Design an enzyme around this catalytic site. Sequence first.
Site, PDB file in Angstrom:
ATOM      1  CD  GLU A  65      37.608  39.107  47.035  1.00 36.00           C
ATOM      2  OE1 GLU A  65      38.711  38.447  47.244  1.00 36.00           O
ATOM      3  OE2 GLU A  65      37.532  40.409  46.752  1.00 36.00           O
ATOM      4  CG  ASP A  93      36.409  43.267  49.523  1.00 36.85           C
ATOM      5  OD1 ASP A  93      36.827  42.536  48.872  1.00 36.85           O
ATOM      6  OD2 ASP A  93      37.190  44.150  50.569  1.00 36.85           O
ATOM      7  N   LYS A 119      45.418  50.670  53.008  1.00 38.24           N
ATOM      8  CA  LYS A 119      44.621  50.837  52.003  1.00 38.24           C
ATOM      9  C   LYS A 119      43.860  52.034  51.762  1.00 38.24           C
TER      10      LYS A 119
HETATM   11  C1  U3A Z   1      48.504  40.861  46.003  1.00 40.28           C
HETATM   12  O1  U3A Z   1      48.383  39.778  46.500  1.00 40.28           O
HETATM   13  C2  U3A Z   1      47.296  39.197  46.007  1.00 40.28           C
HETATM   14  C3  U3A Z   1      46.103  40.200  45.165  1.00 40.28           C
HETATM   15  C4  U3A Z   1      45.081  39.567  44.439  1.00 40.28           C
HETATM   16  C5  U3A Z   1      44.024  40.483  43.601  1.00 40.28           C
HETATM   17  C6  U3A Z   1      42.618  40.592  44.331  1.00 40.28           C
HETATM   18  N1  U3A Z   1      42.868  40.917  45.675  1.00 40.28           N
HETATM   19  C7  U3A Z   1      41.890  41.598  46.555  1.00 40.28           C
HETATM   20  O2  U3A Z   1      41.110  42.223  45.913  1.00 40.28           O
HETATM   21  C8  U3A Z   1      42.029  41.796  48.112  1.00 40.28           C
HETATM   22  N2  U3A Z   1      43.473  41.117  48.334  1.00 40.28           N
HETATM   23  C9  U3A Z   1      43.654  41.258  49.810  1.00 40.28           C
HETATM   24  C10 U3A Z   1      45.053  40.514  50.101  1.00 40.28           C
HETATM   25  C11 U3A Z   1      46.389  40.900  49.892  1.00 40.28           C
HETATM   26  C12 U3A Z   1      47.440  40.601  49.958  1.00 40.28           C
HETATM   27  C13 U3A Z   1      47.564  39.474  50.889  1.00 40.28           C
HETATM   28  C14 U3A Z   1      46.516  38.938  51.338  1.00 40.28           C
HETATM   29  C15 U3A Z   1      45.280  39.394  51.025  1.00 40.28           C
HETATM   30  C16 U3A Z   1      44.037  38.908  51.653  1.00 40.28           C
HETATM   31  F1  U3A Z   1      43.403  39.554  52.547  1.00 40.28           F
HETATM   32  F2  U3A Z   1      43.172  38.437  50.658  1.00 40.28           F
HETATM   33  F3  U3A Z   1      44.383  37.517  52.231  1.00 40.28           F
HETATM   34  N3  U3A Z   1      43.027  42.043  50.949  1.00 40.28           N
HETATM   35  C17 U3A Z   1      41.569  42.314  50.383  1.00 40.28           C
HETATM   36  O3  U3A Z   1      40.892  42.905  51.223  1.00 40.28           O
HETATM   37  C18 U3A Z   1      41.098  42.353  48.789  1.00 40.28           C
HETATM   38  O4  U3A Z   1      40.160  42.845  48.534  1.00 40.28           O
HETATM   39  C19 U3A Z   1      44.780  38.101  44.783  1.00 40.28           C
HETATM   40  C20 U3A Z   1      45.398  37.450  45.371  1.00 40.28           C
HETATM   41  N4  U3A Z   1      46.875  37.962  46.166  1.00 40.28           N
HETATM   42 MN    MN Z   2      39.254  43.225  50.772  1.00 40.92          MN
HETATM   43 MN    MN Z   3      38.662  42.580  47.066  1.00 40.15          MN
END
Ligand code: U3A
Ligand code: MN
Ligand code: MN
Length: 180
Positions: A65, A93, A119
């Site tokens: 990440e 991550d 997840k």
């Molecule tokens: C669909 O929405 C997105 C998707 C992305 C792609 C890369 N993202 C990750 O890889 C990711 N994304 C999340 C997440 C998802 C929805 C809302 C909030 C989060 C949070 F917690 F960040 F805040 N959790 C994780 O743990 C995680 O690894 C980027 C930006 N927005």
């Molecule tokens: Mn994550």
């Molecule tokens: Mn991630």
Amino acid sequence: RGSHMEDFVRQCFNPMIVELAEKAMKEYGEDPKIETNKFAATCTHLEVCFMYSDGGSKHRFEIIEGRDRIMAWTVVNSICNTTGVEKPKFLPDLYDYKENRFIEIGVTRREVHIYYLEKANKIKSEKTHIHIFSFTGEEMATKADYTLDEESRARIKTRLFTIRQEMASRSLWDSFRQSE
Ligand SMILES: COc1cc(CCNC(=O)c2[nH]c(-c3ccccc3C(F)(F)F)nc(=O)c2O)ccn1
Ligand SMILES: [Mn+2]
Ligand SMILES: [Mn+2]
């Protein structure tokens, strides 16, 4: 624009995490000035990963990440093509070198059970470890293997509850909680 949430995000998280979260949301077609709760959540998730990787020895974790999508996949491919683990379908991550497994770190505003299940259904990959924290001090990890010593995880929990308090003191928690 002009959100109270945006100004709180910039003063609550350190500039590098704010800069990394701005790139990520902009890379995926979103703007920190409108989706401000997603801005707060992206920073939070970024900081948790960083504290988590700070919990090991020194060479234990590879941070996935906080990278460009192409470079994060390059590091994942090099990890797969050197240790022999299977390549995940979704970007993780971290990668635990001590335990030879990828880690997906989650931070939710719901009970750790439901978020874990979503997840775990999204991953459907077995292999990669899953570890969820919450803003109420609870955590959930695959096979009850919480990876880090307890101390480190405790810190993450405290930080998450302090973020919730500062949000509520600014009357922005309720909109942040009922938005995930
Ligand atoms: C669909 O929405 C997105 C998707 C992305 C792609 C890369 N993202 C990750 O890889 C990711 N994304 C999340 C997440 C998802 C929805 C809302 C909030 C989060 C949070 F917690 F960040 F805040 N959790 C994780 O743990 C995680 O690894 C980027 C930006 N927005
Ligand atoms: Mn994550
Ligand atoms: Mn991630």
